[PDB]
């Protein structure tokens, strides 16, 4: 990102991620600070920023992969997109499943029904579209010509308001 910004390359984000990889080796390796750097770089960059969400984009993955927050300029999703804080499996395994003590076939079907509801009402682009967090839901074949039109519009983007300074500061 920072290289592309310093040489004025527009940034195109193609998103398909569950977000950060949960684990101890990641935490001990600094995933928080590296992600903070990624958060910072994508907002420092002044170039045209366009995003195409393909299927899942959860949590910090949604954030850092050129959300409209963090000031991406145009946001498109394919109809397969899934925008949420967490996937259906994680939401069920976290809130719902831990109330039963047993892994009974009760909890099995209650969980499967929760997944079924969440993959429709929650992990779908329609909430984000209703709220205008993404700018359009597009048929995939549109993408090439739509990127051409979008970057043609954004070609002369002047970013601001920004206050000039010696430099920004970056989690380092």
């Amino acid at each position: 990102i920072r290289f592309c910004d310093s040489y004025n390359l527009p940034l195109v984000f193609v998103v398909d991620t569950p977000g950060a990889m949960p684990g101890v080796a990641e935490e001990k390796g600094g995933i928080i600070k590296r992600g903070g750097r990624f958060f910072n770089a994508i907002v420092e960059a002044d170039v045209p920023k366009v995003t195409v969400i393909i299927r899942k984009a959860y949590g910090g993955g949604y954030a850092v992969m050129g959300s409209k927050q963090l000031s991406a300029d145009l946001n498109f999703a394919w109809p397969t997109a899934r925008i949420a804080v967490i996937g259906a499996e994680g939401a069920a395994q976290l809130l719902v499943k831990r109330f039963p003590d047993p892994n009974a076939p009760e909890v099995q079907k209650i969980r499967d029904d929760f997944i079924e509801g969440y993959n429709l009402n929650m992990a779908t682009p329609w909430i984000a579209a209703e709220r205008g967090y993404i700018d359009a839901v597009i048929q995939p074949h549109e993408t090439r010509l739509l990127l051409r039109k979008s970057l043609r519009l954004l070609r002369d983007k002047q970013n601001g308001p920004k206050v000039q300074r010696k430099h920004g500061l970056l989690p380092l």
Binding site: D73, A129, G132, Q139, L153, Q158
Partner: protein, 268 residues
């Protein structure tokens, strides 16, 4: 279990079904208050907010933004009636090969009254126009703030005005008035650089005849109060009075043909 073709829908659990679902919702955006309202508008010989954009822009150049947006107000039962687009159509398009950002207010949705998401959509298009340095075209047809939503509307009007101010002397701002613009709607055109009005059918007024009557006893039609002729000859807010919508669009393309895209581009 098989079904007639009238009832069957492709399984939403498939990519093909999701794509079909997108097609359904898109279609549903073309007539967000039902086809009857569009028929009622054509019966008066007026274009819809979508057709006005598609006529003004170059063919196929329009990329719509926030098509599926819905309002979120729960006051006074508004949650029961949440038309797609919240009553403004927004996007960007070329005119004569040069990019412009555009918005067009839909009188069929709550009379075009400005609400929360409606305002947020106009704000988004304004911000895009300013960052990209491209002309902004506003097509205005709404009666005031959506009183059901309340103060929200006034905050969004403030935001729109502030954006028009920031944009003033930066990008060409052109307002087309296409119906009764009432209340706060009138001040954005006044901040924009050029006002084009449609002779018999556009109006701008801050206070309506009913209130004028109540407070002053003066009884006045909307046309006398704020018609295009009045605003041309008496008030002088209006820069052009078009014989019709097509003439208005022609005039706006002419203005754009003389104007540069921004205060620092070389002119055409």
């Amino acid at each position: 279990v098989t079904e007639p073709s009238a009832e069957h829908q492709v399984d939403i659990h498939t990519t093909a079904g999701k794509l079909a679902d997108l097609k359904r919702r898109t279609e549903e955006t073309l007539h967000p208050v039902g086809e009857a309202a569009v028929d009622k508008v054509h019966a008066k010989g007026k274009l819809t907010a979508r057709e006005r954009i598609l006529a003004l822009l170059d063919e196929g150049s329009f990329v719509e933004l926030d098509a599926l947006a819905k309002h979120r107000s729960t006051n006074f039962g508004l949650e029961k009636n949440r038309p797609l687009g919240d009553g403004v159509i927004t996007g960007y398009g070329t005119i004569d090969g040069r990019d412009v950002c555009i918005f067009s207010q839909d009188a069929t949705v709550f009379g075009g009254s400005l609400g929360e998401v409606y305002g947020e959509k106009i704000v988004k298009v304004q911000e895009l126009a300013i960052k990209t340095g491209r002309p902004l075209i506003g097509i205005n047809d709404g009666a005031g703030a959506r009183i059901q939503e309340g103060v929200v509307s006034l905050g969004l009007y403030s935001r729109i005005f502030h954006n028009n101010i920031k944009a003033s002397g930066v990008i060409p701002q052109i307002s087309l008035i296409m119906g009764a613009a009432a209340g706060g709607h009138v001040y954005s055109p006044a901040l924009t650089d050029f006002v084009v009005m449609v002779d018999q059918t556009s109006q701008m007024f801050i206070t309506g005849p009913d209130v004028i009557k109540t407070v002053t006893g003066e009884d006045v039609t909307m046309e006398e109060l704020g018609g295009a002729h009045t605003h041309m000859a008496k008030s002088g807010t209006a820069h052009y009075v078009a014989s019709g919508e097509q003439d208005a669009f022609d005039y706006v393309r002419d203005l754009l043909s003389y104007l540069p895209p921004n205060n620092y581009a070389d002119p055409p």
